[PDB]
């Protein structure tokens, strides 16, 4: 089972205040909403993602479901092509994933 | 659960031949044996790891088990402090992990 994914990280520091969390969650939810509405996911990543793939539109390429971090594997196992998944919270922030393809 | 890990990557090209896979696996198994027999894991990473953390002894720091790549979390299901795990195959090559600490 292989997926081609794009990803966006809305960051949170290690011990965030509740206001920091609320603000990051709000931005992540807004991004999920726009992405589901058809917005260019790569442009959203370039504009808002804090991770190292941001400048490449959040493209992660291909990989097996078992190669994903556990916090994403369960959710992505039942997704279909085109789905936007998230926001998913981790110790580093809120994550938004786009399923570009499955093969 | 959280683990403080060190990591070594023995790389493989995208679509490797069986010969390439075998050669990388051989090198990785040799490193696992050297590490289990007492070799300084950090120095092994400095000398053989292709990842960005190689110069710093392959130190990955503290991580939540649920955030690790699934194939790594699975291989570390019963790991104890000091254990060397691997080689583990991924789409980028063979991986060797050392458990520095756990909590």
């Amino acid at each position: 089972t292989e997926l081609n994914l794009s990803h966006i990280l809305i960051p949170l520091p290690e011990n965030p205040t509740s206001d920091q969390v609320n603000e990051a969650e709000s931005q992540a939810r807004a991004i999920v909403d726009q992405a589901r509405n058809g917005a260019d996911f790569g442009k959203l990543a370039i504009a808002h993602s804090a991770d190292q793939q941001a400048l490449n539109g959040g493209q992660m390429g291909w990989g097996r479901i078992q190669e994903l971090p556990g916090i994403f594997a369960q959710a992505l196992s039942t997704a279909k092509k085109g789905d936007i998944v998230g926001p998913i919270r981790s110790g580093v922030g809120f994550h938004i994933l786009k399923v570009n393809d499955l093969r | 659960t959280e683990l403080n890990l060190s990591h070594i990557l023995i790389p493989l090209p995208e679509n490797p031949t069986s010969d390439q896979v075998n050669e990388a696996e051989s090198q990785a198994r040799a490193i696992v044996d050297q590490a289990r027999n007492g070799a300084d894991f950090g120095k092994l990473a400095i000398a053989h790891s292709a990842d960005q953390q190689a110069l710093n002894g392959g130190q990955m720091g503290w991580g939540r088990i649920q955030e690790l790549p699934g194939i790594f979390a699975q291989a570390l299901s019963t790991a104890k402090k000091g254990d060397i795990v691997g080689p583990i195959r991924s789409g980028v090559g063979f991986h060797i992990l050392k458990v520095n600490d756990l909590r």
């Binding site: 390429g61 190669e67 971090p69 | 690790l68």
Partner: peptide
Amino acid sequence: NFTLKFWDIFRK
């Protein structure tokens, strides 16, 4: 392959 690209996101 995305194995390490994803792991890198969580490193601290």
